[PDB]
């Protein structure tokens, strides 16, 4: 039945000192699954490598670097944050690894490589310990290579900057191994992975009169297989699927996915809670999952009028919408992810809770990412929230400062990474 999730690892400070710069803002596995990268608010990217001797090894620190630095836009006299918005791994070209890291304005291509040898031997001097007198040398010696302890290097290969007027919210690589897209609030640009001085603006929904603004782009993503298909979601709860074969500019959407507005549950907040914060293509590519504030919707790419599935993440927050609006919690941008076989979907919630939904069995579980269970191979108890029986949690006792916004699934195994405000938890199943 349900997967027996167990505590495996925790990475971060043992205290509650968030420091506001160590807060994780993105979690991502690579294509093989052995590497796990996290970016934080301070602009740092940390890569953990699975211990290789199916594979249930632990993750240890593999690399660390400063992806982005704080900047100042003199052109607008505004502080440009170094917070890492998205990290996307590229398919493995050679022995090195590559990723794309984006802040609000700039995308960077980073190469992570291992070096295990160094040059040895000198002509005009010794090994930097002393210099040699001129004319003393009468025999050339070409430097040789000698092994050294393995050390990991991270270097920025290409910078894609100054192309987005607004804050970038999405980057997505194309299946052709050649291009990718970056999407800010109102425009989607297409980049070539080896060209930094120009980009192709494929989508532009900026109105002529800015006081007539009604929609913004909240997420965008390429199809996992099809090289011509991509989707982008908006703050109105609609997803536009664009085909790049029809025309050079994708201003005319091929498909429009939107559910009819239910007049039953109308409220003052129905416009805010209907905004889509994340859209993810299934691994098979035949389904599409969108996350709004209160629910997770699964759409068949052949049916546009309604989703095929709808799961309610946290229904007990429906009566507490005003309170969540007062403290700006209603504007949180949660995420969602599929499993390897597109059968289970995982998303986050409040009070360090994350939700698993099984599509085959229609069973949902709530689990807690807490350090109080800091014992490896310990089964996580399911959690229940009461609107108070035994082992239940009252709604008014939930901590809304503890949000699980970023989660990742291992592309092949049953390993999940869950980012709380300051710690990163890695959970495995009972194997």
């Amino acid at each position: 039945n349900d997967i027996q999730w167990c505590f495996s690892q925790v990475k971060g400070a043992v205290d509650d000192d968030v420091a506001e710069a160590d807060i994780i803002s993105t979690v991502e596995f690579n294509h093989s699954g052995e590497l796990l990268a996290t970016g934080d608010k301070g602009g740092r990217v940390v890569i953990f490598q699975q211990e290789q001797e199916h594979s249930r090894g632990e993750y240890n620190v593999y690399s660390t670097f400063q992806s982005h630095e704080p900047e100042f836009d003199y052109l607008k006299s505004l502080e440009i944050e170094e917070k890492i918005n998205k990290i996307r791994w590229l398919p493995q070209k050679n022995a090195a690894q590559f990723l794309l890291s984006t802040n609000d304005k700039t995308i960077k291509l980073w190469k992570i490589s291992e070096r295990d040898k160094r040059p040895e031997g000198y002509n005009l001097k010794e090994e930097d310990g002393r210099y040699r007198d001129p004319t003393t040398v009468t025999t050339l010696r070409v430097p040789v290579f000698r092994p050294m302890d393995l050390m990991v290097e991270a270097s920025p290969r290409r910078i894609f900057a100054n192309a987005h007027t607004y804050h970038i919210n999405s980057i997505s690589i194309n299946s052709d191994y050649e291009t990718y897209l970056s999407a800010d609030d109102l425009r989607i640009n297409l980049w070539h992975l080896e060209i930094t001085d120009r980009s192709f603006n494929i989508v532009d929904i900026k109105p002529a009169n800015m006081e007539e603004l009604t929609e913004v782009i909240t997420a965008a993503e390429f199809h996992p297989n099809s090289c011509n298909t991509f989707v982008y979601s908006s703050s109105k709860g609609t997803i536009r699927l664009c085909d790049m074969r029809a025309s050079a500019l994708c201003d005319r959407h091929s498909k429009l996915f939107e559910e009819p507005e239910d007049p039953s549950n109308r409220s003052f907040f129905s416009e805010i809670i209907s905004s889509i914060s994340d859209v993810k293509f299934s691994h098979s590519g035949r389904y599409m999952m969108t996350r709004d504030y209160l629910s997770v919707k699964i759409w068949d790419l052949n049916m546009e009028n309604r989703p095929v599935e709808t799961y309610q993440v946290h229904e007990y927050l429906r009566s507490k919408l005003c309170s969540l609006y007062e403290n700006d919690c209603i504007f949180d941008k949660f995420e969602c992810c599929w499993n390897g076989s597109d059968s289970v979907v995982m998303t986050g919630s409040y009070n360090n809770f994350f939700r698993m939904f099984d599509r085959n069995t229609k069973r949902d579980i709530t689990l807690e990412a807490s350090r109080e269970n800091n014992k490896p191979r310990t089964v996580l108890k399911p959690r229940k929230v009461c609107a108070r029986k035994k082992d239940e949690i009252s709604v008014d006792s939930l901590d809304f400062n503890k949000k699980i916004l970023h989660t990742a699934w291992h592309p092949k195994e049953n390993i999940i990474a869950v980012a709380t405000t300051n710690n990163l938890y890695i959970f495995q199943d009972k194997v």
């Binding site: 052109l75 607008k76 900057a161 192309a163 640009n189 120009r198 980009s199």
Partner: protein, 308 residues
Amino acid sequence: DEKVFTKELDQWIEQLNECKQLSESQVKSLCEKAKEILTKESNVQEVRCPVTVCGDVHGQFHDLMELFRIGGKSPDTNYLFMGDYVDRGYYSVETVTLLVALKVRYRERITILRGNHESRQITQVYGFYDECLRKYGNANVWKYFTDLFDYLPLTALVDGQIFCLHGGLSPSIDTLDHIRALDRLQEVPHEGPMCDLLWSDPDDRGGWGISPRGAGYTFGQDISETFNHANGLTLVSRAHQLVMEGYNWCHDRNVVTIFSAPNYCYRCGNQAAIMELDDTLKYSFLQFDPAPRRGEPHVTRRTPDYFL
């Protein structure tokens, strides 16, 4: 020899014309000789008609080349810039270097005043220091240029009838003798007549006022009329405010604001203008658009070659 230095300065000018910087020693020598030239110029410089009065360029080198295309090349055309040669631009270093080189080579043909951005604090905050550090790897160039900026004249007088300055009038300033009595060989203050002359603004509110800029005061039509009547000035040319049409009249054809940076901050989409004063004080405004270019990111809706 004078001839060797003149030839070197010329070659510096043509080198700068394609937007490439100089060496640290070249910049230091240029700044030193520019200071030697400027230490003799009065606070209220006497400029002889005919002359082309230019507004802010704010480090837009290509728009400065467009300005030279519109109005002519120095020394054939007599120019008069009103400050703000740096900050908020991709090529502030090249722009200020070319302007200083032209001033040194053609001191009688080009007159450059001091803008509110010719300060050590402002240049560090708004990217001139950042740009020079990025292009050189040290703060020597910034130090030299900020040392030079102190010597720039505060104001200019054309034919004894047109008053050219960056900011505008000051409550503690009533006669050109008061302006000449100030000490301009210093950093721009946070208060006082010297700061007001570079931070003031015209306004429709009568009398003086409070400038939202944090420095200087806003004056009405009555103040400008009184100043013109007292000093016998036909017109006050002014800058430092962005205008979409390039040039704007105000205070009953007594103050004219000229902005010479088209597409201000590469985003405002405004027009630029330059005011040509003929042999008989006959003013005529030439408006121009940004010089065609691509920008460092060439973001376009036309399909690029890699996708074609």
